[PDB]
């Protein structure tokens, strides 16, 4: 059942608390999500996690279709903040029927809505499908119905109902806050499983944000709270440091799973999010033209270390939140200066998607230049880089990216080196790589050893006759 591992994070918030800003009661008093400590416990003077917040078996372990927006199914699991990352990864693969992915896309940006040029919409919403169609990726997003996480849900809807193909079922995993959700009620079931429903409502539920419709899987984290937005940041970066840590298994000799961000809008906190990714050594891409902080880092992308003390480029955010250079209500702009000056220093781990001279290349290739650009920056002790990028290049099924990038430098010939990769494309099939390696002098009269066939016949197609 796998219910006895994901646990609650529940406790009263109205032991005693004068948070009377919400007028309905003092601060979510009883007959609420607060249900357990309604009798008298010891003191309850301060609820803070010294005052314990329980972990009991869960009540949202099901599957709900959006009524009446769509028809497909999607999985509903709430989870505590202290849940180990290997538990949820076992929950995704072995119990939701999810394949071990080949890359991670962590789209971040601003929570507020935004509208850009429709050329950028026709490029970004098209190519982001064309990533996860070919690779079989996961798209870690931010959950709810507003902002950059709304725009990625547009792109899946722009594919999976128009060219609604089972071949290449995209997997977009929404990580949000059980507590910023708009209808926490109507979704609880200590029974354990439910093919239930709820109804989307956008214009109501003023503070509690509603879930986005177009997502494949939902993961909700909590601290027994409500209204407080950012609580999934110490989960998503703790989760993605494990999925990037976990390896593939496949018969062609396996890889480490790479990881990439995409930033669209940005803003405060997102600038803290980007360099926190690049310090851990995960590259990511900034789009041009749209974005509060995104067009800033697009502008200071190619300039060297010669800093404005940003005040010329303070108000390049086209919305003018706080409306002025001087009335920005952010003292010590020197704080954001260091965050930019660390990002632009790491030239390898940051690329920028220029609209005019890179969009005709693709946004597919630019988002896959960047993973190849990072792994080119980090090899150890010899020609493992042109072994590691090709190890990735099997699992992309992107033959031109294997051709146009890692077959145009000085390839160290040594055609025994292609033998752990020639074995990959034969089992995986993937037939188009074999013509690429036969172009590069992988002589079949030398390659087929006795022991290779013994490894080959142990890896037949299991469904075959």
């Amino acid at each position: 059942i796998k219910k006895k591992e994901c646990v609650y994070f529940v406790e009263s918030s109205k032991l005693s608390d004068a948070g009377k800003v919400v007028c309905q009661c003092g601060y979510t008093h009883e007959q609420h999500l607060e249900e357990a400590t309604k009798p008298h416990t010891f003191q309850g003077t301060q609820w803070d996690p010294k005052k314990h917040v329980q972990e009991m078996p869960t009540d949202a372990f099901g599957d709900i279709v959006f009524t009446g927006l769509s028809q497909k199914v999607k999985k509903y699991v709430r989870v505590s903040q202290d849940t180990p990352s290997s538990v949820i990864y076992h929950l995704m693969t072995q119990h939701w029927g999810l394949d071990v992915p080949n890359l991670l896309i962590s789209v971040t940006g601003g929570a507020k809505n935004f509208n850009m040029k429709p050329r950028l919409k026709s490029i970004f919403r098209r190519g982001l499908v064309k990533v996860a169609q070919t690779t079989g990726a996961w798209i870690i997003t931010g959950g709810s119905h507003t902002g950059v996480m709304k725009q990625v849900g547009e792109a899946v809807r722009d594919f999976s109902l128009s060219s609604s193909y089972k071949e290449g079922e995209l997997i977009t995993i929404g990580v949000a806050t059980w507590g910023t959700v708009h209808r926490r009620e109507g979704l609880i079931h200590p029974t354990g499983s439910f093919p239930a429903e709820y109804i989307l409502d956008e214009d109501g539920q003023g503070n509690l944000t509603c879930l986005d419709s177009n997502h494949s899987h939902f993961i909700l984290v909590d601290d027994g709270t409500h209204g407080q937005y950012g609580v999934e940041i110490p989960l998503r970066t703790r989760l993605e440091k494990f999925i990037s840590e976990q390896t593939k298994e496949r018969g062609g000799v396996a890889i480490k799973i790479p990881i990439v961000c995409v930033v669209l809008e940005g803003g405060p906190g997102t600038l803290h999010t980007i360099d926190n990714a690049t310090t851990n050594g995960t590259p990511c891409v900034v789009v041009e033209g749209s974005g509060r902080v995104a067009d800033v880092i697009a502008q200071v992308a190619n300039l060297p270390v010669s800093d404005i003390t940003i005040s010329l480029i303070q108000q390049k955010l086209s919305v003018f939140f706080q409306e002025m250079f001087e009335t920005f209500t952010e003292s010590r702009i020197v704080e954001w200066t260091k965050k930019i000056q660390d990002i632009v220093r790491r030239r390898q781990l940051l690329t920028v998607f220029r609209e005019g001279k890179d969009g005709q290349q693709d946004v597919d290739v630019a988002i896959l230049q960047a993973l190849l650009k990072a792994s080119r920056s980090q090899d150890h002790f010899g020609h493992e880089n042109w072994d590691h990028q090709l190890k990735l290049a099997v699992a992309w099924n992107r033959v031109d990216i294997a051709r146009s990038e890692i077959f145009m430098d000085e390839w160290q010939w040594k055609p025994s080196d292609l033998h752990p990769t020639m074995t990959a494309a034969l089992i995986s099939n993937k037939p188009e790589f074999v013509k690429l390696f036969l172009e590069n002098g992988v002589q079949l009269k030398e390659f087929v050893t006795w022991d290779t066939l013994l490894y080959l016949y142990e890896n037949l197609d299991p469904s075959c006759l």
Binding site: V22, C23, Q24, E202, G204, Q205, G206
Partner: protein, 284 residues
């Protein structure tokens, strides 16, 4: 292929201004007269010469310069002084230089090229009020405006059945009575004579001048804006404003309406509404 090369035939062939607007229109809603166009550089008559003149037509209904149902005199009948409260014709303005230069009270917001009409029924300011009845609005249990970040507002506006917009009571000095009694220009058709402290629980928003279409050079409508807010969504304060609504002898409807930049009142309240919306951080 044939549809795609057709996409390539068409692909390679590519080698003070804010003084008046509504008063400066042509038609004025009763008699077909328009005689002076003034643009955004000749509006303040104190600045430029404007040797060309608008001919005059006054009092709009009954008696051109006599105005015995209206209540003002002739220019040969020794026009009453500029900033005097006396008498029952309240000529006490809010701006200082209320100018009676030509023997008649010329307006201070620049020349609109008009007559001296008694569309105001008064050769003066006609200091009016607008009870901005304000529901900081709700949902099933209390809402905000999720559209930007702001707060969404609800305002009672009455659709009068003849004129095609949705308005508020114009407290424009009920004849013989004061300003809280042309507050009851329409509010007498909301049936209560009991509660009379409506603006006593009011909060001032904006004192000044409106772009009324029925203005002229000698009659123009400046005003005071008064808010009556409600933060409870809950109890007797909204209830005494709602349970005292029989509307028994009313024309069409008085329904609660949300606010935006797209409500069906045309000009006067709509340029006034955002100043009420600015005070409480509303969406407009």
């Amino acid at each position: 292929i044939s549809n795609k090369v057709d996409a390539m035939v068409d692909l390679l062939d590519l080698d003070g201004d804010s003084y008046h607007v509504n008063a400066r229109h042509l038609l004025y809603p009763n008699c077909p007269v328009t005689r002076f166009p003034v643009p955004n550089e000749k509006v303040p008559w104190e600045t430029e010469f404007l040797i060309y003149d608008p001919p005059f037509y006054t009092a709009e209904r009954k008696d051109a310069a006599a105005m015995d149902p209206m209540g003002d005199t002739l220019e040969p009948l020794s026009t009453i002084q500029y900033n005097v409260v006396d008498g029952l014709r309240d000529r006490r303005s809010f701006h200082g230089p209320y100018t009676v230069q030509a023997g008649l009270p010329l307006n201070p917001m620049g020349r609109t090229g008009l007559r001296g009409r008694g569309s105001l029924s008064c050769f003066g300011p006609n200091h009016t009020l607008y009870p901005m009845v304000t529901r900081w609005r709700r949902n099933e249990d209390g809402a905000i405006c999720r559209k930007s970040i702001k707060k969404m507002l609800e305002v009672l506006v009455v659709k009068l059945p003849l004129s095609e917009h949705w308005a508020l009571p114009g407290g424009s000095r009920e004849p013989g009575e004061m300003l809280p009694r042309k507050l009851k220009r329409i509010l007498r058709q909301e049936h209560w004579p009991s509660f009379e402290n409506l603006l006593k629980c009011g909060m001032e928003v904006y004192k000044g001048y409106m772009d009324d279409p029925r203005n002229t050079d000698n009659a123009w409508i400046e005003t005071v804006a008064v808010s009556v807010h409600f933060q409870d969504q809950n109890d007797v304060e909204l209830n005494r404003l709602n349970s005292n609504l029989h509307a028994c002898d009313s024309g069409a409807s008085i329904r609660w309406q949300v606010v935006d930049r797209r409500i069906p009142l045309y000009a006067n309240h709509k340029t006034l509404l955002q100043k009420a919306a600015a005070e409480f951080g509303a969406h407009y």
